[PDB]
């Protein structure tokens, strides 16, 4: 796994947190605890009460993802 992720180094990935937040960003680095450094990250906004992805983005730039709330990482389709 700490090996598997290196395969996606420098590439854009999806991430899902506990609570529901979803983001995308470029994998710049990470540790064994699953703390990430993502570049050019865009959080995918959610319908306030429906919960669904609105299609709208929000830009965050260079970010440190906390492994404590990280649930899912996944590459782009293809």
């Amino acid at each position: 796994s700490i090996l598997d992720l290196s395969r996606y180094q420098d590439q854009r990935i999806q991430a899902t947190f506990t609570g529901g937040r979803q983001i995308t960003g470029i994998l710049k680095g990470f540790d064994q605890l699953m703390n990430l450094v993502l570049d050019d990250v865009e959080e995918q906004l959610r319908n306030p009460e429906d919960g669904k992805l609105t299609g709208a983005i929000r830009k965050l730039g260079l970010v440190v993802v906390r492994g404590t709330t990280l649930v899912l990482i996944a590459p782009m389709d293809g």
Binding site: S1, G20, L33, M34
Partner: protein
């Protein structure tokens, strides 16, 4: 039968992964590690019955899910 031991024993089987929020993931397990980080092949995301996404490969933090059971 440790959590690891249990997890090893379910490699290559369709597994059900429930989130505290009642979102489910299901896909064939593929890989593990000491910290319960799971690597799955093709993965489907459901919001109670309703498929809502598919991931070709996925990494899932076991530490942060509700449970892991074998379908």
């Amino acid at each position: 039968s440790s959590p690891n031991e249990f997890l090893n024993k379910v490699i290559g089987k369709k597994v059900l992964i429930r989130l505290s929020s009642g979102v489910d993931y299901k896909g064939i397990l593929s890989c593990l590690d000491g910290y319960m980080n799971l690597a799955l092949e093709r993965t489907e995301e459901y919001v109670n019955g309703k498929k809502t996404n598919v991931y070709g490969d996925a990494f899932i933090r076991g530490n942060n899910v509700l449970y892991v059971s074998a379908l």
